[PDB]
Design a binder for this molecule. Sequence first.
Ligand code: PSC
Lengths: 180, 86, 47, 116, 89, 56, 86, 469
Amino acid sequence: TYYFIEITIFLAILCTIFIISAKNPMVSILYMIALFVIAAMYLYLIGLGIFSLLYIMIYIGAIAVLFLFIITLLDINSTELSVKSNIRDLPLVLISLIVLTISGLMIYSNDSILINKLLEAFGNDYNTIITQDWFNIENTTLLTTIGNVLLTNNAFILLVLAIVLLLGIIGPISITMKHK
Amino acid sequence: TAAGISLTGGRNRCFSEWQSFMHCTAKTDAKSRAQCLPNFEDYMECLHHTKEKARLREIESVLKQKKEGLEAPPVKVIPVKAIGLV
Amino acid sequence: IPSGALGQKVPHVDESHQDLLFRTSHMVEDLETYDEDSPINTSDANT
Amino acid sequence: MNTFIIFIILIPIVGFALLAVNILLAVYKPYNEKLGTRLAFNAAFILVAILFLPFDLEISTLLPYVMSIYLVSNYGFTIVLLFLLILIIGFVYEINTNALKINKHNKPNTDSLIYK
Amino acid sequence: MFIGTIILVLSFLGFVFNRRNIILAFICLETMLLGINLILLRNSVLFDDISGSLFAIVIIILAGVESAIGLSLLVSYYRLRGVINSYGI
Amino acid sequence: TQAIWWPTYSPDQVERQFLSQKIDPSAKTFNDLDLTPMELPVSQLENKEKTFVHIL
Amino acid sequence: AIPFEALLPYGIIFGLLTAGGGAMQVLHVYRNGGVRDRFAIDQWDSQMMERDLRLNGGQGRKQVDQATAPEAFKHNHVWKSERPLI
Amino acid sequence: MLILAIISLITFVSMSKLSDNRAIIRLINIYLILVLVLDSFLYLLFLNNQTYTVMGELLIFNSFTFYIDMLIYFIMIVISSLYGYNLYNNNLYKTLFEPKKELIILFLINILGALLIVHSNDFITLFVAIELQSYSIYLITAIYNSSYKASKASMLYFFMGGILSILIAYSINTYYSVLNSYTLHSLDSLIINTLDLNLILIALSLGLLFKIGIAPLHKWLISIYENTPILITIYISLIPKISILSYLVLSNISINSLVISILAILTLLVGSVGGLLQIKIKRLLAFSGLTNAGYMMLLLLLNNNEFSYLYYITQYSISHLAIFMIIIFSIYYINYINNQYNPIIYVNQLKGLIHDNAYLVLSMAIVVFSFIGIPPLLGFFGKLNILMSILNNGYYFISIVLIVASLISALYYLYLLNVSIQDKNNILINSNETVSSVLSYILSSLIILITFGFIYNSLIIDIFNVYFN
Ligand SMILES: CCCCC/C=C/C/C=C/CCCCCCCC(=O)O[C@H](COC(=O)CCCCCCCCCCCCCCC)COP(=O)(O)OCC[N+](C)(C)C
């Protein structure tokens, strides 16, 4: 049970390709819900069990529900993935795939050197040593510290965020009412 | 801010190297910053472990080519079922 | 002749530019009449 | 290897088994008579699920606070009070505007009977 | 960093070469935000701090609000045109 | 697949597939008894949509 | 008055959940070795449980009380080596 | 005090009827005036470039940012006067210039999000404020939803703002992955030498800059500015420009960058020669904004650019504001009103404007020659003080490209003049109803600033010398 992270990486690739090539618009949206589940798997896998259920609650249970709710009672035309339509795209898809992929891998590195910048992204092989220290006396888990720092050090960010939630109330109402 | 706050609300893993670098930067003005280059280096490889990865690759390159391998007090691996068995 | 900052021929836009041959022309989004919002083009829009 | 994951994998085994039992067991035998544009909708239908989400995002924003409630005592309390009241004002916007109503288009035609 | 980078890149290119409908563009936007989340939360775990977790919990809420705003924007796009084209807006 | 209660394919049926219709000429067909058998063999609605109402 | 027949399927629901809870409690106590479960475990108490598995010798929560620790206790100490996190 | 206005306002607007909207805007207009007059004495806080950080190194308040918020309030007073006052009392201008119920809500929320960018110190304050102002521009674009062009423009602006917000988020977390930090106060003159922060900080600046309309990705914004109605587009052209540029000028993370110099050369080129053969007045008027944002991308390369910036900002703001208000006024004299949201489109429709209200053409000529940079007017000293910073700091090819770009851009500025001073057959003699006293006084104030504002240059340089040094 070593290669779990590699498996989630591969399954996420495959799920995005099934997102962007799908018969029916909501077959594509169910593949997105599956990608959210693969994400939450990776987040529990890395050690963040809190966030995975936050993803399942907020992204799956509200955003995907809103999205499916939109696709139901609105009319959306769709062409399917013809080969006549989209292999005119493929040479720039290949060039931009390799370039954007390498370039996203580039900025984790500090060299003057171009491909020493690149292959330090693959210098991964060393197993981190986890030590126990007995300095912490209480059950401050991660949600507790998020609640301490949203509320003391970044209280202003929480209140500007309240203004953003207010805007998310006012705006959709203001569009779709047709006042008398 | 949340400058040095860790997941448990304590100090993070590289807090002490950062606080040494800020102790450096507090008592210096510019034109005199070239002397707190080591503290910053100590901070950066605290973050990313670049020099330790280089050192461990240098030692693993040598232990791969030995027929003898390891003549040392070795290290044991256990299953999680057997931490205090014997 | 109306001119267009380089001495070019530009169209004088009267009310006679929104018919149904001027409907969905081939053009740049500049130098194009047939606006989609016009009191002769909507003309019982949500009825 | 806990008793948590046998559940996660075993509930599908329950389902896969039962719909197998029926598909394996029952008659298919269909035909034409057995087998068998778009409508418009009011604004409150789409509105209930669009404005649902900003209240849901507030309810899970209270969730970091109510776990940290002892540590931020007297101070995070007032920050949360201000947060809640800022969102109560957008809610009183929403119910003063009568947004979520679907209202009936035909009245008793109140206008009186005059003559000549 | 690999999973977040590749979901962001594949999500971006699926957004860019979308010619088939409009809601693929929405869901490719949301999966881009997911990939940004993945990269940041991994960095927070590796650096032993909450501040990446702070930016991640804030960008969750901002992604939700942008989905609500933009889908009401699509509904108002649809009000006057009872059809959504396949080629795009 | 035959060892089931549903009507499985017979093995002598692929055998009959290679065989084909060779009919007796010294017989009497449909026109004996007076019948002849039956033989085996986007741009304008967008703009009309532009005058309807879709959200009330 | 009271229909016994109406409340008998409630009686079987009550009995099934009662017998399930009782059988499950005895299964938990048999797993622990005669004591109750720990229903909310800290990071501190997680580290304390692995330390006591190290100290008692093999057993789960045998809970030795000895004066001074044994000989193999100084040598059976564990670090955890976690994979690259690709 | 914006927060007070929003909190008060949505409470008050939910209970008003739609008959009261215009008067509500008048109220807010006067409110903002007394926030300028009664509260600007806070400039005394910022003596000798004393800088504060507020909310735990979260917001940064210096005198630069104080000037930017004063400028944003002045412009909001002008724009809210344009919505809250009638042009004429016809049954015509009531069906043309009509505010929605929730327009001033979105205005004040956007002014809030625009202030929290310039006042920002950390990256998550920057992010949250960028999305606050971005959602507000989405909804200000989409609020006149009975319009095909504005609906299509709001959808386009949603997707193109979503990409360039995810690029900013990628750059921020990419900066976080190499430095356990959120501040650019972290950088402090030594880290930049021993660390390659070039690709990070330049990708940050680029993702911020493509929302302004810099040159490879300019056409989508020109289409949004042509498709929005004439009152909305004077606000959404100005406010993201001055907010995002006032962020990127205060934070000097692209000093002597080769990419920003490439895109500044390209911006000056494609804006000058892009709007030459164009016949719509908002198109013509938006490529002017493209060039004048290029002149700011130039100052992004600079260290210590706060005079040239702030002078050319209030220059461009007054000139921009006045040239949109003049073509609001010319709608009374055109022979052809189409398109209720956008009643004047083609620039040949103002053709006989010297024979009907010649002093409107005097107004127009003054602000157009200040766009060109003619020395008695205020735009000249803006271009002059930009050149004094470009040449001081070694950008010699950039200087000649600036000069050629200004010469090419003078053609389509003067094309407005060339159209308006011309013969027309049927001229006005006698018109019964008058333009708004309150609202033509604003245009005259904006002209008198442009013409006679060179008087106060030495006063302004002395007050500059004390509060920023
Ligand atoms: C009761 C008063 C209430 C407050 C009124 C404030 C309104 C804000 C309006 C902004 C746009 C209108 C232009 C006004 C320019 C003001 C120049 C100035 O003074 O700005 C200063 C220099 O600006 C700089 O570097 C460069 C600034 C460049 C200015 C270039 C335009 C020149 C011509 C117009 C300005 C002169 C008009 C004077 C007309 C009598 C920098 O900030 P301060 O802390 O010293 O401000 C203090 C102003 N107080 C005392 C009135 C609060």
